[PDB]
Design an enzyme around this catalytic site. Structure first.
Site, short mmCIF file in Angstrom:
data_model
loop_
_atom_site.label_atom_id
_atom_site.label_comp_id
_atom_site.label_asym_id
_atom_site.label_seq_id
_atom_site.Cartn_x
_atom_site.Cartn_y
_atom_site.Cartn_z
N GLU A 11 28.55 -113.96 -35.93
CA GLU A 11 28.14 -114.33 -37.28
C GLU A 11 28.94 -113.64 -38.37
O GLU A 11 28.95 -114.12 -39.51
CB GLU A 11 26.65 -114.04 -37.50
CG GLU A 11 25.70 -114.83 -36.60
CD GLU A 11 25.65 -116.33 -36.91
OE1 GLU A 11 26.29 -116.79 -37.89
OE2 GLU A 11 24.98 -117.06 -36.15
N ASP A 20 27.88 -121.17 -44.61
CA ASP A 20 28.07 -121.09 -43.17
C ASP A 20 28.90 -122.27 -42.65
O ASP A 20 29.41 -123.07 -43.45
CB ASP A 20 26.72 -120.93 -42.44
CG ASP A 20 25.87 -122.22 -42.44
OD1 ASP A 20 26.35 -123.29 -42.86
OD2 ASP A 20 24.70 -122.15 -42.00
N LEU A 32 20.65 -117.37 -42.95
CA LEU A 32 20.59 -118.63 -43.68
C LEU A 32 19.59 -118.50 -44.83
O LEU A 32 18.44 -118.09 -44.63
CB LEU A 32 20.19 -119.76 -42.73
CG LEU A 32 19.92 -121.13 -43.36
CD1 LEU A 32 21.21 -121.75 -43.84
CD2 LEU A 32 19.24 -122.02 -42.34
N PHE A 104 19.04 -118.34 -32.59
CA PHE A 104 19.44 -117.78 -33.88
C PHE A 104 20.31 -118.78 -34.66
O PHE A 104 20.12 -118.98 -35.86
CB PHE A 104 20.19 -116.46 -33.64
CG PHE A 104 20.50 -115.67 -34.89
CD1 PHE A 104 19.72 -114.57 -35.23
CD2 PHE A 104 21.58 -116.00 -35.70
CE1 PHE A 104 20.01 -113.82 -36.38
CE2 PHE A 104 21.87 -115.26 -36.85
CZ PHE A 104 21.08 -114.17 -37.18
N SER A 117 19.35 -128.78 -19.77
CA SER A 117 19.97 -127.46 -19.73
C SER A 117 18.96 -126.39 -19.36
O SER A 117 19.24 -125.52 -18.54
CB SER A 117 20.57 -127.11 -21.08
OG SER A 117 21.56 -128.05 -21.46
O1 LIG Z 1 20.40 -124.61 -24.39
C1 LIG Z 1 19.64 -123.89 -23.45
C2 LIG Z 1 18.85 -122.83 -24.20
O2 LIG Z 1 18.31 -121.94 -23.20
C3 LIG Z 1 17.29 -121.16 -23.65
C4 LIG Z 1 16.55 -120.53 -22.66
C5 LIG Z 1 15.47 -119.74 -23.02
C6 LIG Z 1 15.15 -119.58 -24.37
C7 LIG Z 1 15.89 -120.21 -25.36
C8 LIG Z 1 16.98 -121.00 -25.00
#
Ligand SMILES: OCCOc1ccccc1
Length: 162
Positions: A11, A20, A32, A104, A117
């Site tokens: 950052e 930003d 922010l 963040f 993910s």
């Molecule tokens: O893009 C996957 C983000 O992974 C995370 C996993 C736990 C808490 C916040 C984010």
């Protein structure tokens, strides 16, 4: 390395109001202020955050104060999110930092939606998760940073931050 040193690298530190990467008024270590295009609105948010009339300028101590608040708030947000908490708790401390870093930058509501993910991370399918993380606006708009954060998620090491 730790979450503060990591986010400080990603950052930067600037003591005057700046925009930003998304064009939004910000100060300090990625604090922010507002998404408003009105500089006066940003100045009002700054003064409210610091508790004095700042005229768009703060001290390093003030920047670090906001930073500690912001990191704290990011973690507490994760912990109160029903989708994020179990994944966060499943991770080791280094990968937790990568998670905090994303939240963040991007905010909790958006990150909580990265369902595939998240699943791969909880399953500890690290290379797959890393591939999935890069299929994103986030990666395309901030690739240098995203590569560092992804390497951290992939490896559970600080190799990307030296
Ligand atoms: O893009 C996957 C983000 O992974 C995370 C996993 C736990 C808490 C916040 C984010």
């Amino acid at each position: 390395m730790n979450i503060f040193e990591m986010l400080r690298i990603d950052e930067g530190l600037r003591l005057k109001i700046y925009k930003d990467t998304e064009g939004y008024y910000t100060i300090g270590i990625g604090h922010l202020l507002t998404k408003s295009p009105s500089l006066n609105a940003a100045k009002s948010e700054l003064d409210k955050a610091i508790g004095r009339n700042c005229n768009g300028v703060i001290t390093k101590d003030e920047a670090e104060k906001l930073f500690n608040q912001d990191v704290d708030a990011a973690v507490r947000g994760i912990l109160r999110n029903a989708k994020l908490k179990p994944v966060y708790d499943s991770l080791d401390a280094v990968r937790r930092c990568a998670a905090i870093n994303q939240v963040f930058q991007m905010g909790e509501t958006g990150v909580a939606g990265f369902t595939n993910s998240l699943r791969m991370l909880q399953q500890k399918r690290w290379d797959e998760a890393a591939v999935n993380l890069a299929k994103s606006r986030w990666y395309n708009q901030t690739p240098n940073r995203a590569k560092r954060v992804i390497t951290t998620f992939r490896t559970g090491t600080w190799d990307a931050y030296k």
